[PDB]
Amino acid sequence: MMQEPLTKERLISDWNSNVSVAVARTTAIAKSSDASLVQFLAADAAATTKSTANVLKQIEPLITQPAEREILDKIMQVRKTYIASRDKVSQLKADGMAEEAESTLINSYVPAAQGYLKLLGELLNLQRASLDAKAA
Amino acid sequence: MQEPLTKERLISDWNSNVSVAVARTTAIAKSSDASLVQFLAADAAATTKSTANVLKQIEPLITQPAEREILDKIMQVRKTYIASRDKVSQLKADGMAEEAESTLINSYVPAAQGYLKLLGELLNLQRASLD
């Protein structure tokens, strides 16, 4: 059974929210012809990725059992791809290279974001099941 | 324990939806390109339908006078919020680019902030039950 499942569930809820926010923001950036939009959203984007960095600092020590450790390792590998593609979409759009940004969005960012959210859901499912198994 | 836990989970989904909509609406307002209104419209409709579904799910689970008071206030604030959200997109579609930005700042964001504050208050009632 997962230990401290409720604490991890709350941290993953915030993490999921941050990913969902960043996906909405990056998608809007990629599809707008306004190259300056990435600059006008940059402080908000920095706040969202910092919030996840903080979640990671809190949650990593609490992820202990093999099933949740295996998922966390998978999340960290996909997150590397996700961050590289997010930053590339943003740089291309800032640089006026709109077609390349749109191509990167679909070819790289979207699959990485979808995998990131799917793995976060697998991680959450482990926690929720453990908590629901002790609730009574 | 199960009832406040289910409500906490629903409120966390609701909070995510509002947070996503605030980011999306902010991008629509600040983009000089008004085409985001149409290209993001189905994603925005899905985020707001998701919240409509959470509202239907959580209603039968409301048990306490303070929950009901907060939910009633959320319904009022959500009306103000939805009108302003929709107005940002209508202004962008109508070519009123500067007014879309000013309406974001002076109407949509304050309503969203009050909406999130109330969701936090509703969430804290569940945390109190779980502690």
Numbering used by the authors:
A (entry chain A): 57 to 192
B (entry chain B): 58 to 188
From the paper:
Bacterial chemoreceptors sense extracellular stimuli and drive bacteria toward a beneficial environment or away from harm. Typical chemoreceptor proteins, such as the well-studied E. coli chemoreceptors Tar and Tsr, consist of three primary domains: a periplasmic ligand-binding domain (LBD), transmembrane helices (TMs), and a cytoplasmic signaling domain (SD). MCP2201 from Comamonas testosteroni CNB-1 binds different di- and tricarboxylates, which are represented by TCA intermediates. Citrate and L-malate have been found to be the chemoattractant and chemorepellent of MCP2201, respectively.
